[PDB]
Structures are given as C-alpha cells and as structure tokens.
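subagent[fold] <- orchestrator: predict structure for attached chain, return tokens only, no commentary.
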Amino acid sequence: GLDSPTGFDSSDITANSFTVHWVAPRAPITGYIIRHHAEHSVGRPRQDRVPPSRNSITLTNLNPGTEYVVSIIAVNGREESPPLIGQQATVSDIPRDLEVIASTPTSLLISWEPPAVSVRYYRITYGETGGNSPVQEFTVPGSKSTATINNIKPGADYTITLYAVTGRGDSPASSKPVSINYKT
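subagent[fold] -> orchestrator:
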C-alpha cells in the first residue's frame, strides 16, 4: 500500500556526527521516524524523529570512527510503510594514509589526509634503528597535510610515527597513534 523511502545515501559525515539522506515516497505520509544505534549500542536504540519535509538528519554525540545502524520508518497516520535500514560509518579521529611520497638519503616526505575533526597540530616521531626509545619528535601546526622529515641516518632502519592532538588545555586528548616502518 505505501512505498518505503529509499535512495538512501550518506554524506556530510563527521567523526562525532554525520548526515543521512533518503528520498521521499510518492504517497501521502505524515513524516518519518528516525531510529539509530551502533551494533555494540545498548539494547535501547536512540529515537530521532524528523518532519516529512526533512529528508536529511544530522546525528551528533556519536562515537567517532564507528559503524552506526540507522533506520527510517515511513508512517501515514494509521498506515505504516516498509522499514528502511542502512549502515554508515562515522569518520575516524586518527588521520589516514600516513606514507612517504618522496625518499631522500637523509630525509623523507610524509603525507596524510586530515581527519574529520579540527586538529590543533600533529606530533611526529623519528624512528632510528635502535633508537626505539630515543626517538626524535617535532610538532605539526596543522599548517599542511604533508611534512618533510630530516636528520635521518642513512643505511639505518627507521620508524616514523605520529600522534594527532585536537583538544588541549582543559582536556588534552590524542587519538590512537599511527606508525609505519621506513628503511633509510
């Protein structure tokens, strides 16, 4: 009797928030009920409702970097349409694609994609063969998504690792660090 909304598409995805989009059926409806929750969510899914004129809903207060289950229900008062469920993953707090685009005997070029949250700066550590602990680190004023690494001993195994710091002062927290191995 009633067509269920579809054309489901996700975008405007944020770490703790992300937008969901769906098309509106061609039959008279009173609005859609939005229910969303993660697979590991509590047996009590969240309840979000949106007006019929709204086909996109922005979710917030969500765990960054997680697969969320979102369901859309079309209702026309006493009649209900077939449920619609899709899965969307919230971006990850840690940047990504930490790799080298250029390689020099004593230096290397690092490039990575900025996360989905504002970052004050990123911390990058230098990995020297046995310098497992005596690593050398430098900060990254989020000025560029790529940086250059210099002061590296040639012919020596190296490890490049970096930590991203967004909140600072009241709640200085860092995301899980990402590291890679590099031979010099």
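orchestrator: received. Logging for downstream: Residues 50 and 102 are 49 Å apart (CA to CA). The longest strand covers residues 66-75.
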